[PDB]
Write an enzyme that holds these catalytic residues in place. Structure first.
Site, PDB file in Angstrom:
ATOM      1  N   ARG A 281       0.895  -1.338  -0.048  1.00 25.19           N
ATOM      2  CA  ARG A 281      -0.104  -0.174   0.033  1.00 25.19           C
ATOM      3  C   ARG A 281       0.964   1.186   0.005  1.00 25.19           C
ATOM      4  O   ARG A 281       0.599   2.267   0.652  1.00 25.19           O
ATOM      5  CB  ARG A 281      -0.893   0.115   1.271  1.00 25.19           C
ATOM      6  CG  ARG A 281      -2.118  -0.767   1.238  1.00 25.19           C
ATOM      7  CD  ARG A 281      -2.996  -0.565   2.729  1.00 25.19           C
ATOM      8  NE  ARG A 281      -4.325  -1.142   2.679  1.00 25.19           N
ATOM      9  CZ  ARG A 281      -5.001  -1.747   3.658  1.00 25.19           C
ATOM     10  NH1 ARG A 281      -4.570  -1.314   4.984  1.00 25.19           N
ATOM     11  NH2 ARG A 281      -5.977  -2.240   3.475  1.00 25.19           N
TER      12      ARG A 281
ATOM     13  N   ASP B 220      -4.575  -6.712  17.724  1.00 27.54           N
ATOM     14  CA  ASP B 220      -5.232  -5.723  18.551  1.00 27.54           C
ATOM     15  C   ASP B 220      -5.948  -6.522  19.718  1.00 27.54           C
ATOM     16  O   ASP B 220      -6.057  -5.579  20.552  1.00 27.54           O
ATOM     17  CB  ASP B 220      -6.013  -4.826  17.556  1.00 27.54           C
ATOM     18  CG  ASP B 220      -6.905  -5.583  16.832  1.00 27.54           C
ATOM     19  OD1 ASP B 220      -7.580  -5.302  15.972  1.00 27.54           O
ATOM     20  OD2 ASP B 220      -6.910  -7.200  16.847  1.00 27.54           O
TER      21      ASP B 220
HETATM   22  O1  LIG Z   1      -0.367  -9.102   5.470  1.00 26.08           O
HETATM   23  C1  LIG Z   1      -0.497  -8.074   5.860  1.00 26.08           C
HETATM   24  C2  LIG Z   1      -1.819  -7.347   5.986  1.00 26.08           C
HETATM   25  C3  LIG Z   1      -1.913  -5.982   6.467  1.00 26.08           C
HETATM   26  N1  LIG Z   1      -0.557  -5.506   7.199  1.00 26.08           N
HETATM   27  C4  LIG Z   1      -0.806  -4.062   7.868  1.00 26.08           C
HETATM   28  O2  LIG Z   1      -1.448  -4.254   9.018  1.00 26.08           O
HETATM   29  C5  LIG Z   1      -2.661  -3.184   9.434  1.00 26.08           C
HETATM   30  C6  LIG Z   1      -4.077  -3.709   9.075  1.00 26.08           C
HETATM   31  O3  LIG Z   1      -4.446  -4.487   8.157  1.00 26.08           O
HETATM   32  P1  LIG Z   1      -5.587  -4.185   6.874  1.00 26.08           P
HETATM   33  O4  LIG Z   1      -6.034  -2.764   6.767  1.00 26.08           O
HETATM   34  O5  LIG Z   1      -5.615  -4.651   5.815  1.00 26.08           O
HETATM   35  O6  LIG Z   1      -6.815  -4.602   8.282  1.00 26.08           O
HETATM   36  P2  LIG Z   1      -8.301  -4.418   7.777  1.00 26.08           P
HETATM   37  O7  LIG Z   1      -8.862  -3.197   8.236  1.00 26.08           O
HETATM   38  O8  LIG Z   1      -8.766  -5.018   6.511  1.00 26.08           O
HETATM   39  O9  LIG Z   1      -8.550  -5.842   9.240  1.00 26.08           O
HETATM   40  C7  LIG Z   1      -2.476  -2.165   8.213  1.00 26.08           C
HETATM   41  O10 LIG Z   1      -1.349  -1.200   8.638  1.00 26.08           O
HETATM   42  C8  LIG Z   1      -1.558  -2.858   7.115  1.00 26.08           C
HETATM   43  O11 LIG Z   1      -0.576  -2.080   6.287  1.00 26.08           O
HETATM   44  C9  LIG Z   1       0.369  -6.189   7.198  1.00 26.08           C
HETATM   45  O12 LIG Z   1       1.536  -5.574   7.562  1.00 26.08           O
HETATM   46  N2  LIG Z   1       0.596  -7.346   6.404  1.00 26.08           N
HETATM   47  O1  LIG Z   2     -12.341  -7.027  12.579  1.00 21.04           O
HETATM   48  C1  LIG Z   2     -13.144  -5.784  12.488  1.00 21.04           C
HETATM   49  O2  LIG Z   2     -13.812  -5.361  13.348  1.00 21.04           O
HETATM   50  C2  LIG Z   2     -12.778  -5.230  11.436  1.00 21.04           C
HETATM   51  O3  LIG Z   2     -13.941  -4.100  11.112  1.00 21.04           O
HETATM   52  C3  LIG Z   2     -13.509  -3.340   9.870  1.00 21.04           C
HETATM   53  O4  LIG Z   2     -14.858  -2.510   9.703  1.00 21.04           O
HETATM   54  C4  LIG Z   2     -15.864  -2.727   9.055  1.00 21.04           C
HETATM   55  C5  LIG Z   2     -16.635  -1.454   8.927  1.00 21.04           C
HETATM   56  O5  LIG Z   2     -16.078  -0.349   8.135  1.00 21.04           O
HETATM   57  C6  LIG Z   2     -18.057  -1.926   7.959  1.00 21.04           C
HETATM   58  O6  LIG Z   2     -18.832  -0.901   8.146  1.00 21.04           O
HETATM   59  O7  LIG Z   2     -18.856  -2.842   8.848  1.00 21.04           O
HETATM   60  C7  LIG Z   2     -17.990  -4.009   9.032  1.00 21.04           C
HETATM   61  C8  LIG Z   2     -18.991  -5.242   9.390  1.00 21.04           C
HETATM   62  O8  LIG Z   2     -19.859  -5.673   8.833  1.00 21.04           O
HETATM   63  C9  LIG Z   2     -16.612  -3.943   9.587  1.00 21.04           C
HETATM   64  O9  LIG Z   2     -16.956  -3.664  11.134  1.00 21.04           O
HETATM   65  C10 LIG Z   2     -12.392  -2.595  10.113  1.00 21.04           C
HETATM   66  O10 LIG Z   2     -12.031  -1.768   8.846  1.00 21.04           O
HETATM   67  C11 LIG Z   2     -11.180  -3.538  10.370  1.00 21.04           C
HETATM   68  O11 LIG Z   2      -9.874  -2.757  10.558  1.00 21.04           O
HETATM   69  C12 LIG Z   2     -11.225  -4.505  11.481  1.00 21.04           C
HETATM   70  O12 LIG Z   2     -10.312  -5.204  11.806  1.00 21.04           O
HETATM   71 MN   LIG Z   3      -8.070  -1.565   6.895  1.00 23.75          MN
END
Ligand SMILES: O=c1ccn([C@@H]2O[C@H](COP(=O)(O)OP(=O)(O)O)[C@@H](O)[C@H]2O)c(=O)[nH]1
Ligand SMILES: O=C(O)[C@H]1O[C@@H](O[C@@H]2[C@@H](O)[C@H](O)O[C@H](CO)[C@@H]2O)[C@H](O)[C@@H](O)[C@@H]1O
Ligand SMILES: [Mn+2]
Ligand SMILES: O=c1ccn([C@@H]2O[C@H](COP(=O)(O)OP(=O)(O)O)[C@@H](O)[C@H]2O)c(=O)[nH]1
Ligand SMILES: O=C(O)[C@H]1O[C@@H](O[C@@H]2[C@@H](O)[C@H](O)O[C@H](CO)[C@@H]2O)[C@H](O)[C@@H](O)[C@@H]1O
Ligand SMILES: [Mn+2]
Lengths: 265, 262
Positions: free
Chosen positions: B14, B184
């Site tokens: 990214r 997390d």
């Molecule tokens: O294989 C991976 C997938 C994700 N990330 C990173 O870990 C964080 C969370 O991932 P992502 O945004 O895809 O999480 P989501 O919102 O989809 O759960 C971000 O800082 C990414 O750049 C990483 O370092 N390795």
């Molecule tokens: O595991 C998580 O909670 C996960 O949630 C992602 O967020 C989405 C939200 O943007 C969308 O509106 O609804 C989804 C559920 O149906 C979900 O909550 C968040 O982006 C990701 O970082 C979190 O790990």
């Molecule tokens: Mn994300």
């Protein structure tokens, strides 16, 4: 007696408003007892009428007062056996939902005044303070606004403050009697000096209504010409008595997560 | 200088999105330093390009990583000199207005995770937990909702918690690596066990946006959510108990926007 609060409601020439609010508060969860601070000198209390309408969820003690003083509700009442006190003016109706949540907040910050009416003090002339709300520029640092007080007339606070209040400097008691105003300003001073933290935390009410107009009798204290002017006066007088401005600013506004539904997004 | 914080941003496939966010965060007030956990094993870091486009307001350090592991961002970096760490995913844009406020909240609760994304666990069959958000019935008492976690991917938390994490039961580390998820959730477990209070405090973002699309995302993967529940249960086992504590506190900035108190 544990995990419960005591409602202290001072009433003056608002008996009709009082009976209505009493029907409301008596039914609130976690309410241990109600103490009506009757400030109608030489006027027959309502207790009789109140009993004819029993049974009631909790005990209601009607204490007749010597004179009509704003401070009377700040005495150390022996029948208060709860750690927390809920103080409400006899013209305000706070929904049960707001009380339960706010009380649960008080338990996480017992040393602070948890309420629904926030206010602030500002300064323009080095050393001279003024009283007001959000209509005055933020004294604070950057964004938003700030508040340095939470009016006790719609709040939950540790009952040990009533004691601490009594132990305060004579000049302060004098000041309150001399104006029959700013008793809540004093309490805020007293609290913050004791904790070193903001005197209160603001909990945004989801449903709080003021019934001022819905009453036979007086229009209400804050409508007097010299009300506000009188309040700016008090802040300055207290700075003199305590020799220092103790109030501390805060911009924390607490709402109930998910109440109403999805209010987090 | 507890009057500042360090941004820890982990990036993976990214870079375009990273370079964009970087322009934003470098200008946030009270930002002391930025530590980019470069998880692209094999590719060359943007450092050169970054400096070719300097000067920047703060020192940005790109730390190449041996492997692509989610927990890489939870290492104790010697270059972190602030008590507070701002941890943001590389696809999330949190307004300065929100950061400045949230940071000021963390300073009043340094032992807690102050963040913009709250979530929770629930239990229907005694002992078995499930991961979710506001789509799941409130577990708590009877009014509104409850949250038991605040995703570190958009939060402020004490830097001493990264060292405290390194000292967690090996099994915890294995779990994170194993699923490449749950870091997390492990952190929330850690902090609550430590302070005995709710793991985090939720601050409602006034202006936060996700740029996930503009760049594809981890949570879109079929087994993402199901994994998170799994993690709560595994963690509960590794700790012989469910520590997370519910909280219904939502903090907003008094007067921001104007008159939001009325
Ligand atoms: O294989 C991976 C997938 C994700 N990330 C990173 O870990 C964080 C969370 O991932 P992502 O945004 O895809 O999480 P989501 O919102 O989809 O759960 C971000 O800082 C990414 O750049 C990483 O370092 N390795
Ligand atoms: O595991 C998580 O909670 C996960 O949630 C992602 O967020 C989405 C939200 O943007 C969308 O509106 O609804 C989804 C559920 O149906 C979900 O909550 C968040 O982006 C990701 O970082 C979190 O790990
Ligand atoms: Mn994300
Ligand atoms: O001379 C007075 C005026 C008011 N009050 C009481 O003190 C509180 C606040 O008064 P009010 O509602 O008039 O205050 P405002 O909202 O107008 O400042 C209420 O519980 C009243 O019943 C009192 O005991 N004596
Ligand atoms: O001394 C007070 O601050 C006083 O304020 C009263 O509130 C009103 C508010 O309801 C109205 O909207 O604006 C007025 C002027 O700005 C004022 O703030 C409150 O009712 C009373 O109890 C307070 O003592
Ligand atoms: Mn009134």
């Amino acid at each position: 007696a544990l995990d419960s609060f005591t409602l202290i409601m001072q009433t003056y020439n608002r008996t009709d408003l009082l009976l209505r609010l009493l029907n409301h508060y008596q039914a609130v969860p976690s309410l241990h007892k109600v103490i009506v601070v009757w400030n109608n000198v030489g006027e027959k209390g309502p207790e009789e009428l109140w009993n004819s309408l029993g049974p009631h969820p909790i005990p209601v003690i009607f204490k007749p007062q010597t004179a009509n003083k704003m401070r009377n509700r700040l005495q150390v009442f022996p029948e208060v056996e709860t750690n927390a006190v809920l103080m409400v003016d006899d013209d305000t109706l706070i929904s049960a939902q707001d009380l339960v949540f706010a009380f649960s907040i008080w338990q996480q910050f017992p040393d602070q005044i948890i309420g629904f009416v926030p206010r602030k003090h500002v300064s323009t002339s080095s050393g001279i303070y003024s009283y007001g709300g959000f209509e005055l520029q933020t004294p604070g640092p950057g964004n938003g606004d700030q508040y340095s007080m939470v009016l006790i007339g719609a709040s939950f606070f540790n009952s040990k403050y009533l004691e601490l209040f009594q132990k305060q400097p004579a000049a302060v008691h004098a000041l309150i009697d001399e104006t029959q105003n700013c008793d809540d300003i004093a309490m805020n001073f007293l609290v913050t000096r004791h904790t070193g933290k903001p005197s209160g935390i603001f909990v945004k009410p989801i449903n709080m209504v003021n019934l001022e107009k819905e009453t036979n009798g007086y229009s209400g204290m804050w409508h007097r010409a010299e009300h506000f002017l009188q309040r700016s006066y008090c802040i300055n007088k207290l700075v003199n008595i305590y020799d220092g401005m103790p109030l501390k600013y805060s911009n924390i506004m607490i709402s109930q997560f998910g109440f109403p539904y999805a209010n987090h997004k």
